[PDB]
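During the second half of the funding period, the structural biology subgroup turned its attention to how the target accommodates small molecules. The most pressing case was mercury (II) ion, which had performed well in the primary screen but for which no bound structure existed. We therefore specified the complex as follows and requested a full 3D prediction, including the ligand pose.
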Amino acid sequence: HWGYGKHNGPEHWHKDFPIAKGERQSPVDIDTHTAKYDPSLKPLSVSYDQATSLRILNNGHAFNVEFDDSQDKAVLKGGPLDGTYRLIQFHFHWGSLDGQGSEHTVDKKKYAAELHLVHWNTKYGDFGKAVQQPDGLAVLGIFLKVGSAKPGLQKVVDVLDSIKTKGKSADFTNFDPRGLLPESLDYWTYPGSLTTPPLLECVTWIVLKEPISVSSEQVLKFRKLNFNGEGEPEELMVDNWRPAQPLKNRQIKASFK
Ligand SMILES: N[C@@H](Cc1ccccc1)C(=O)O
Ligand SMILES: [Hg+2]
Ligand SMILES: [Zn+2]
């Protein structure tokens, strides 16, 4: 099974998922001096007021906070997007040390972690059909740096003890994703892919420039999770990030000047 170790990590993914060496793979390094401000971009709209979380799950590579997407409750639109994208789940990527963990990098800078809010284009009916389209998904990426604690994240942190191992899930209702957002919505955008197998190239990436700060204690809690299942040798869930991939024939647009 794919993972982040030496024998099943990112360098091995292309074997089971050839698209790993595709033309629009993510993450990528965001070179701020090559990214161009795009006037055609409309303001970004993040509407999470009616978000309805359902459960939190440890899938062996990260933990997913799932949402009820049977209705337009939590949506993303505007910016580089055409139409409406519904929030289906969010998760993080983090390191074993504060100096690494993010997937996208800014001028080669690696953040301690990165949050990915995954949304699917409503014109496709469901997530399954959406990931069969070039504009099927929109992922809002938010960098995490270690400093002050993030209050809106503590609820996630305190439930991790109940889903320490692969396969474990816990009721995670009434979680407000708005508490994970930074002040500014300035962002960089480019066409990309999911950063975990199957690495589908259906994502319009919207990476926020402003990182959120989380405490050392909070990230340390992330690092207590296990990649392994209950009863198996303990392998700490850390460094579950894919490195920057070739930008190839792509242009990163900045929503700001
Ligand atoms: N390997 C997982 C990858 C995944 C991660 C997160 C959400 C959905 C899927 C799969 O069965 O999907
Ligand atoms: Hg696609
Ligand atoms: Zn991700």
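Two results from this model are relevant to the next phase. The CA atoms of residues 65 and 191 lie 24 Å apart. The radius of gyration is 17 Å.
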